[PDB]
């Protein structure tokens, strides 16, 4: 029943398309963080190294993990992990983080629906799973998607906690509303 | 069949999993409260910013996101559980999670027959609409993870020993056979 066409389109839209949107949204969130820092004469370094708990990754790390979730998630679903761009996680500044987002966005632009032809059924096994696997469809739904939103939300929470006036519209972004 | 099963899995099934996960997270909050001699009401009223909604509200909103999301996608707006946000206790919030889990259990893949293409318009949208496909991907899903992660973060910030595994829940791991 054309199931390959549906599975591939959905998985493409959930990952390449929606993850690119959310990463752009994360960029917009940082525009508010810069406005705050300027207005409150807060050092951006302080925000970038802030965190919600002493044993939880800081803001720089949340951004890095969000980007990796999108990048590696797509690489994995499309069977292209060996071709994926590598990042050493050396970023310490907002500029560098904006570059990291931009790179992942460019990477994601390179894919099409057809790259996901067999994504639903591909066997994904991470190094710490002792050979056990999830199908690509399961991995998207239960692993990659929750994780992407977890780390973007936690980045948002760090900023919000520090006083940045980011709101839900900044996280969701524009909707493709249609006139009736 | 087409997007019916996929939209059902993305919403009914995975949101159910996540709410079950949220319930389990509160088991850890209870452990913490007893061990650290912290009153649960303290945690329920905690927040990440003075002007952001507190834990109770994050839980209420995550439930309503799942509930109303599925109601809208399936076009079944005539009857759904009505909650009034009167909950002040953990017992009450667990009843609210249970209520939505029960509601979501009543749906099948067939209820999503036209969810991809249904037009969805909220009251504040001025007649403007999204397709159910767009609504699920761009609105419902992100909103559900937002509020659950924020609830997690409030607990985590206050010292509750939750980790990523509590948030994701169990994975359907399989052993390779070919």
Distance (Å, whole) CA A178 – CA A158: 34
Per the listing, tokens 């397709």 go with: B131
Mutation target among B5, B7, B113, B173 for the A interface, most CBs of A within 10 A: B173
Identify the CA nearest to B147 among candidates A156, A159, A108, A17: A156
Distance of CA B42 to the CA centre of its chain: 22
Question: A177 vs B49: CB contact, 8 Å cut-off?
Answer: no
* Number of residues written out for chain B: 178
In order of B11, B115, B122, B125, B148, the CA distances from B80 in angstroms are 16, 17, 16, 21, 21
Whole-number Å distance between alpha carbons of B15 and B141:
8
Q: Quick check: A145 and A18 in contact, CB under 8 A? A: no
Question: Where are the domains positioned within chain B?
Answer: 1-169
Sequence-distant contacts of B99-107: CB under 8 A, at least 24 apart: B99/B63, B100/B19, B100/B63, B100/B66, B100/B67, B101/B16, B101/B19, B101/B20, B103/B67, B103/B70, B104/B12, B104/B15, B104/B16, B104/B66, B104/B67, B104/B70, B105/B16, B107/B8, B107/B12, B107/B70, B107/B74
C-alpha to C-alpha distances, A24 to A21, A98, A106, nearest whole angstrom: 5, 10, 12
Give the DSSP H or E segment for B120.
strand B119-120
Q: Do B134 and A52 touch (CB under 8 A)?
A: no
Indicate yes or no: CB of A177 within 8 angstroms of CB of B48.
Answer: no
Contact A116, A74 (CB under 8 A): no
Kindly give the pairing relationship between strand B130-131 and strand A123-124: unpaired
* Phi, psi (rounded to 5 degrees) for B130: -120, 155
B1-169 CATH pick, 1.20.120.450, 1.10.150.120, 2.60.40.3680, 2.40.110.10: 1.20.120.450
Which residues of B are less than 8 Å from A171 in CB distance?
142, 146
Q: How far apart are CA A129 and CA A144, in angstroms?
A: 15
What is the topology classification, in CATH, of domain A1-173?
Answer: 1.20.120
Contact B147, B138 (CB under 8 A): no
A142: left (phi over 0), alpha (psi -120 to 50) or beta: alpha
Query: Pairing between strand A123-124 and A134-135?
Result: antiparallel
Resolution (angstroms) stands at: 1.8
**E strand or H helix at A124:** strand A123-124
């Amino acid at each position: 029943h054309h199931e390959n066409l549906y599975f591939q389109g959905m998985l493409y839209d959930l990952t390449v398309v929606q993850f690119s949107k959310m990463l752009k949204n994360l960029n917009a969130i940082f525009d508010k963080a810069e406005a705050f820092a300027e207005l409150k004469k807060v050092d951006m370094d302080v925000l970038l190294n802030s965190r919600l708990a002493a044993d939880q990754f800081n803001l720089i790390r949340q951004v890095q993990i969000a980007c990796d979730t999108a990048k590696v998630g797509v690489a994995r679903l499309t069977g292209q992990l060996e071709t994926a761009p590598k990042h050493d996680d050396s970023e310490t500044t907002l500029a560098e983080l904006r570059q990291r987002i931009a790179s992942v966005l460019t990477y994601l632009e390179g894919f099409s629906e057809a790259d996901f032809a067999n994504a639903a059924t591909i066997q994904i096994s991470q190094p710490r799973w002792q050979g056990k696997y999830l199908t690509g469809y399961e991995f998207a739904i239960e692993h990659a998607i929750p994780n992407l939103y977890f780390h973007i939300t936690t980045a948002y929470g760090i900023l919000r906690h520090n006083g940045v006036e980011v709101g839900k519209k900044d996280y969701l972004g524009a909707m493709p509303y249609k006139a009736p």
